[PDB]
Amino acid sequence: MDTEKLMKAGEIAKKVREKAIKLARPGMLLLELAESIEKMIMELGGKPAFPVNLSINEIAAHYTPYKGDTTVLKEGDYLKIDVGVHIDGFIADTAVTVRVGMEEDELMEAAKEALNAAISVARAGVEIKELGKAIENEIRKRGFKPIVNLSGHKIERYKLHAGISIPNIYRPHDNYVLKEGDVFAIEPFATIGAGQVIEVPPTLIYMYVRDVPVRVAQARFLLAKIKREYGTLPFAYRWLQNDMPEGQLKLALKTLEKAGAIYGYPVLKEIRNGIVAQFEHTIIVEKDSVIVTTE
């Protein structure tokens, strides 16, 4: 495997990471904000893997803007920036919780420590759950609320949640062995609000899933065009918003939705508005160590 190249995926992913970071300042209208990042990734020719996430405050994830959006950050807005890019399949995912204009509060430390821990413990030839453990402990340590459902994942070429969910918990069933080539993105999310996250309207991101011969004209055309340019990875309403008469469009893939050619990730919301702490890094287990493609 060409982990070598893969790494680049994270390096750019970093380059963006770092930059995307400083720009997270009140007055930064997510829309512009995002875009900024996105094509900045494009600047290196880094192929994105999904759109730039900006869930913040109590919304877990799955929020990239669409044009028509505004939302300029307010200070302390516990912003979440999640970057994803790959290079012909070879993915990369790194995420940061950002307290807008302010400091690394205790919440921030936690999730970051979390990551840390898992890495420390991280070594090919381990039971996932041991990571899982590490994690919770760093959160019960700082006394907080991890998120149950929303956890890290194994990835494969061209496949985001290609599998094995490194939970932010020691689930005594994650008796799975990490090995040389196994590669995961450890996504530690925390909060204060109970511990879950929920599906939430709207959905700005969808992704192809299967060809179901369509009946409505430009629908076929959409899933066809969607197919062409995107394939398996996700995209936003924003991504298509520059392609037709607005409603006609939503409607379109919406029709496409139900037929089943694509799925649409809504948003997740910290079940009870708990501050969505969130930090992410992708690695690869090898043996005694592992490596951070997203430094």
Curated annotation (Swiss-Prot):
Entry's pH dependence statement: Optimum pH is 7-8.
UniProt entry keywords in alphabetical sequence: Aminopeptidase, Hydrolase, Metal-binding, Protease
Cofactor(s) demanded: Co(2+); Zn(2+); Mn(2+); Fe(2+)
Record-listed a divalent metal cation 1 binding positions: D82, D93, E280
Catalysed reaction equations from the record: Release of N-terminal amino acids, preferentially methionine, from peptides and arylamides
Entry's transmembrane regions: none
EC number from the UniProt entry: 3.4.11.18
UniProt protein name: Methionine aminopeptidase
This protein's encoding gene: map
